[PDB]
Design a protein around this ligand. Sequence first.
Ligand SMILES: C=Cc1cc(C)cc(CC)c1C1C(=O)N2CCOCCN2C1=O
Ligand SMILES: C=Cc1cc(C)cc(CC)c1C1C(=O)N2CCOCCN2C1=O
Lengths: 688, 688
Amino acid sequence: LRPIATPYPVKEWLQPKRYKAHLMGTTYVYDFPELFRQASSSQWKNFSADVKLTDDFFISNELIEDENGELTEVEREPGANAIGMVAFKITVKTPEYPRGRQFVVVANDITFKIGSFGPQEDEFFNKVTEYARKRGIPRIYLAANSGARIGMAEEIVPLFQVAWNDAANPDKGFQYLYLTSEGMETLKKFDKENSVLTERTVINGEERFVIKTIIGSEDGLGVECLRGSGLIAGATSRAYHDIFTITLVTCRSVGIGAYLVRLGQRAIQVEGQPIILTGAPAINKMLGREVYTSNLQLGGTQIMYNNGVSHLTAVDDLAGVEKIVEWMSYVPAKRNMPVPILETKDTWDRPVDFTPTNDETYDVRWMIEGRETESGFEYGLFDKGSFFETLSGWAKGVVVGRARLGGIPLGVIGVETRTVENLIPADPANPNSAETLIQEPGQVWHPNSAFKTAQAINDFNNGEQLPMMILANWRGFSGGQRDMFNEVLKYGSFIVDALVDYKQPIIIYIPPTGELRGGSWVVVDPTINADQMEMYADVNARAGVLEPQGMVGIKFRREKLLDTMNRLDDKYRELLPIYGQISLQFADLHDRSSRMVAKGVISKELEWTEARRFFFWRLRRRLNEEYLIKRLSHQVGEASRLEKIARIRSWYPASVDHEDDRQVATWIEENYKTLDDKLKGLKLESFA
Amino acid sequence: LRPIATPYPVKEWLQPKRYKAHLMGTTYVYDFPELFRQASSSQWKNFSADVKLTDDFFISNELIEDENGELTEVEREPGANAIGMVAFKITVKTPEYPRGRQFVVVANDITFKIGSFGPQEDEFFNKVTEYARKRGIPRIYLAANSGARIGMAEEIVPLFQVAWNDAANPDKGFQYLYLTSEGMETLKKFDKENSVLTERTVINGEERFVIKTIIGSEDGLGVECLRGSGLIAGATSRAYHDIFTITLVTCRSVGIGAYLVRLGQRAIQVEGQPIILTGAPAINKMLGREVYTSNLQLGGTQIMYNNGVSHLTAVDDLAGVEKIVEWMSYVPAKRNMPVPILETKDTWDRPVDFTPTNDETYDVRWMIEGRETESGFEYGLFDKGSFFETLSGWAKGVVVGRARLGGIPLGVIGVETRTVENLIPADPANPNSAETLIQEPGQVWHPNSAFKTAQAINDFNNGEQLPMMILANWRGFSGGQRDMFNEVLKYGSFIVDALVDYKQPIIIYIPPTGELRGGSWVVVDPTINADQMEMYADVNARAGVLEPQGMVGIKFRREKLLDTMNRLDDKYRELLPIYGQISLQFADLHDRSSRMVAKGVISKELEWTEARRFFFWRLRRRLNEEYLIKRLSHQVGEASRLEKIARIRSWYPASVDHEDDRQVATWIEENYKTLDDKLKGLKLESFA
Ligand SMILES: C=Cc1cc(C)cc(CC)c1C1C(=O)N2CCOCCN2C1=O
Ligand SMILES: C=Cc1cc(C)cc(CC)c1C1C(=O)N2CCOCCN2C1=O
């Protein structure tokens, strides 16, 4: 029966599957809407202690397929799913969407045939993805599965006979497998003749139906699960370019399960749940030897989070879900909505407190989110508490996150100035093969950090649809043998390709003690995408083709020194010490932000402590002008960006200074509806 | 003077730069059109010994910028270039384009400031790329360069004075650098006050103009070369999605030079010419120790061709150019032209000769291009001699190439069944760190072979604009620790993403002894892109979720055997040997192409020896129906692929069997112009 004397009903007995799920260290699929409700709740509590919710703040509906295969909402009993894939549509009012926002969750039912993917789960999962794409609404996937479903035609097992080379002597081989008349019948009576393909023969006496192929009556044995999982691999791929996708790995993801996790890109892994391609036993079986002890060895976090396959880890499901929800709070409600402004106690109008010093090491995170100290909080460039770092465990050379600038959400990339000690494990399959330690210097791009940067940019672009700031501060790419061989050129280029695709505003900003130097500058220069990119250098930054040291090695050598000695010494070789020094200073006079301005390679030179005030409005002004540029784009007789921009600006009042971000932003917001009348007025002129 | 008594004029003296070029082991830039003429010539000789060319068969024009910055054609004297970038527009009649085809070549002039990129070279290179894009015409780049141009404000060197902490004692430091009245003048007279930024002071006596930034009068010192090379990085990126790009590395490519090589993707490297990010001396200088001896260590072929950064190597320039020309012969004349049919003595109507056997090892290349033998040539699937393998030196697990099916050019990917022994060099920078050898089993995807496959697919798609065949034959992905850690999931997914983008017809075809198995099938299944993809399995192929061995381990264990013993033995544990065998055979009866048909996961099951005849027409029929589907696409009231396809087919005569490739192809080609009248007829109906 039950556990006997509990105060409320025992749920794991009302529905024994809930227990099955738990036995396998995961939340029962029908309990996940409850986890999301719990997390939305916490989101509110953290934003405003005092606000009063009701249960109408959060709604979950199961989605199922109707009589014509369309999805609808139903309210039914947890456990009634006939297939092993389940979905909910969720409408939730959040701090960022007080009147409510929507998304779908799809989820493997780990208790239904080991949460394996058969054809029916695959067609369902695909319908759910399309339902989300069509509405523009984000698609959360909760992966707990065993990969594709394996089978065999059980109905043939008790039937088939064998053609012995000679009987009384199995021993020596067989010719082929077959059925008898009475085999054939047993199939016809069970309505199942389609289960084999055969050929009549008679052999000395009887008649024999040679099996030539076994098809099986039960759907979901072999290749139909393959077509199955192809469909949804492709379906996820497309998703990722279309709507916010994200995946929580909740008890294990195997096979197509693993690839689904990656194709939707954004993934959070729960400690102790593996993302694998095949299991340890099956690999050991192939290799013939017990090399791997657990799946955790192959697809646990020490692998997938160190990869960048896993963007975050989580301590359990609920923590998983809190992350999804928080990641999701930077993201527009549907495809092509404005990004969700959300202002907190940290208004835009303040100095930036925390400032790097030249001789002093620091964590760039301090510059981004500020820093607790002995004598109080020192604010950084973005809103206190608003920094959601992702890919934290891979390629620690860059740091990438989401954050808010006075409410405005954006992707952020900073450069980590401390040396990373990246440690690569021995691979147990290799007889002997030791742990290997990689020193990764700071403000140098390596293959992995270049990859991560590119990756980050695409993930801001793709469903997140965010603007972006890059706090650029690289001295260059590593171009020594190991890193060339590992294709630093390949991953460097990804960065350019991603910049080219980017569809929202981008600020590049060389910070106070920062630099950009040859290659690193190039990969990030505005001309790569003049439609979206703008560059700023702090007054205490440096940029140019070489370091002053490198510069001197080539354009201020012995002869050039001595000759300067020749004119700065009334006396005139024991001055090298200081003349070398002079030359270094002479180079460095070339690398100033003043010169960047002079050559018009940057938009402004900034002062760090004034940066937040500047970027808040610059960004705000830009989102407003973008929105207008779009409105215009949807006319008929289309035109260059330059032309559209030009004629939007011809709408501003004559006194408005186009260069003044606050003024322009404020006037646009005072006039959206007037601006809108103006478009309406064009549309009529724009038949011809 | 000269070398004295030569029969014709000494060219390296008429133009001394030609000699400079040669001294550095490369062709003088103005001699490259001649190399292309020599190669086009050879192309003709190989196609038809007897055909009679004249000099009007090949035309090269220099392109330069006119008075308003537009490019035009000129005929002038080699050496007259004022900037260090040079370009030609080339019109050439080829076997594939008898009436002629066009492309541009841009090229560093290695003799002009070490072929470095300044702002003027960068704006020129960009204009040339746009000129090519606008016309749809391929862009060849000939890289021999020193990267970005470094400089300093030479005019300030003789002038600046120093503020000593105390003079007669340089020793102990300096405050700042400055100029005098007479400094200032020297600048004003040379018209150059903009060269520094200064501030008046008077110090005990005189007056001092403190240098605060050095700008310099000469353009092309620092950051303006950075904006420069950003522009063209982006410009190449876009190129690659737009027109056929390719790059020959001809004496060395450095810096932005290296990245340009990669961004345009298709690269051929001449043995002994490095593709580097920084030089050895400069790296050794950073690291403080002579670790690297040559640039060849960092960017020679043993690195870049083993990378896949270099698609081919070449023995010298001319061989470089022959490759470009041959690669280029598979490619449409401009963006969106039909791919260039070209039939040879190897007509479509023949059996395929060479056939793999189960116990016998072979080189898949034999299946593709056929095989010379003791007793004569045995033809493979494609036209004899027509296979142009690329990426030959990287990730030998797959083989990728271009080839012709009865004249029709296509991308081909096959799987290499032999074990690759991939050997990774010691990295000299690491104190001690030995050469490491990697065993890569056949018909298994690894990170690199997955990458290469994805890479290949994109390069067929992107300017080549080719259809594609994949001879699919993978047992699966490697999912053991090393390959998980190295992100096999990441590169696997690239493959799906590329399939999704593909815009021409795709045949997937499991060959005679071949298989696809779980994951490998999925990554390649038609539902990923039903618009372009079709799958075929040979009658002797196998596919399904597991190997029969793996299948048995899970669905036919001890209990299930014994019980079969129980009914197949009048007698009934010494039969394991053979019953295990029976079960394996029982599984395998599930994995037949007959079952694939039954479940409609493939379009047809094929016989290898009939495959060429089948695919020739299937492909031909498809190109014709594609062309029509496009024509339709350019209407107004647009519609699903399904709908367009449906109504094109409603145009075929009633007797035409839609299923008959030859019939349909032949009727379309007999009626292009009638079909065209039909479209004209729609266009009028399609205002409303
Ligand atoms: C990492 C090298 C690199 C990469 C990119 C993308 C762009 C550029 C041009 C500034 C470089 C360059 C770079 O760092 N250098 C180092 C200085 O030598 C002069 C040549 N040089 C480059 O051209
Ligand atoms: C490499 C594993 C993989 C990868 C992809 C893309 C698709 C699929 C589903 C067939 C697989 C799968 C795969 O090979 N298997 C192995 C058999 O176990 C059952 C689970 N399984 C998969 O789901």
